[model samples]
Target: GRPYKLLNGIKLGVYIPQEWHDRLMEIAKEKNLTLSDVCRLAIKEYLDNHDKQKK
Candidate 1:
């Protein structure tokens, strides 16, 4: 499978709780999206929300 667009050439290495990882898998399956896409959206939302505060 091709890598998700938002994660192209990007990599993150971290430990995620198994429970949360499973939950992300389940959600992605139900929503027809990749787990990485879900995480990318989450990260984008986080950065978007904090932009003004960080400025």
Candidate 2:
């Protein structure tokens, strides 16, 4: 399989508690960042920390 792009473009879905989503969106808007940016940052952090076995 081809390696996934890190900063180019991607799509994903996540389920967050309603309250958490609300809070996250609020912070995102305050920081002038999109919801997608917040989610991507979170995914990047997870992969950085947890992806131990390289293919």
Candidate 3:
């Protein structure tokens, strides 16, 4: 059994439009990166860069 899998493990599921799915595949093929990698980087950058100032 995997020890790490027992703790500090997380998962995310994202469903996008059919059109976007094709687009993602295109970019992934061109860039030689997995769809999950692209989404993970984009998601983290978006979350990190977005302003979190108190309203």
Candidate 4:
């Protein structure tokens, strides 16, 4: 597990397909989670891959 980095947040302009959008919302609803939490993981994952592309 990764440590949670405490930092300020920004609102990014993102558009996702319906399937991904639906699942993200479903996960939040089932776990009493905020979409912000889901968005954090998305940023983590996308940036992780972005780094991988460099090598």
Candidate 5:
């Protein structure tokens, strides 16, 4: 896992669908997580698995 404490975060202003944002917010509330945390975790997991693939 990457160091969340050490890294200074940058903003990612990606334009996503409203439905996706709604789902994300729902999940965050259900799990008592921040929207930013959930979004960051989602991206981290995606890159973790995807980075294993060879080009």
Candidate 6:
């Protein structure tokens, strides 16, 4: 079976509050990570912590 895939992964857009977005961007820059990478890591962390509840 194919692994689950994120629908429209290449096209999805999240609307973060401006302040949060700015802060995340600043941290991303300081950490030498791309904004996209930062967002992906954050989502991955959330999923890792929350997925068990779905079972």
TM-score of each: 0.57, 0.53, 0.59, 0.46, 0.55, 0.57
Cand. 4 TM to true fold: 0.46
Query: Candidate 3, residues 1-55: lDDT per residue as tens digits?
Result: 7688678659888776778678988998899987778888886777767856422
Residue pairs in collision within model 5: none
Runs in model 2 lying further than 4 Å from the true structure: 1-17, 52-55
Residue runs of model 6 more than 4 Å from their true location after superposition: 1-9, 52-55
Candidate 4 vs 5: which has more lDDT: 5
lDDT of 1 by residue, 1-55 (tens): 7668856686776566778778998998889987778877888788879786533
Lowest summed-lDDT stretch of 10 residues in model 1? 6-15
Q: For residues 2-52, write the lDDT of model 6, one tens digit per residue.
A: 355835356666666778768887998789886778877888788879896
Clashing pairs in 3: none
lDDT of each: 0.78, 0.76, 0.78, 0.72, 0.76, 0.75
Per-residue lDDT value at 43 in model 5 = 79
Q: Candidate 2: deviation at residue 8, Å?
A: 4.6
Q: Candidate 2 vs candidate 6: which has greater lDDT? A: 2
TM-score of 3: 0.59
Q: Model 6, 54: alpha-carbon shift in Å?
A: 12
Runs in model 5 deviating more than 4 A are 1-7, 52-55
TM-score pick, better of 5 and 6:
6
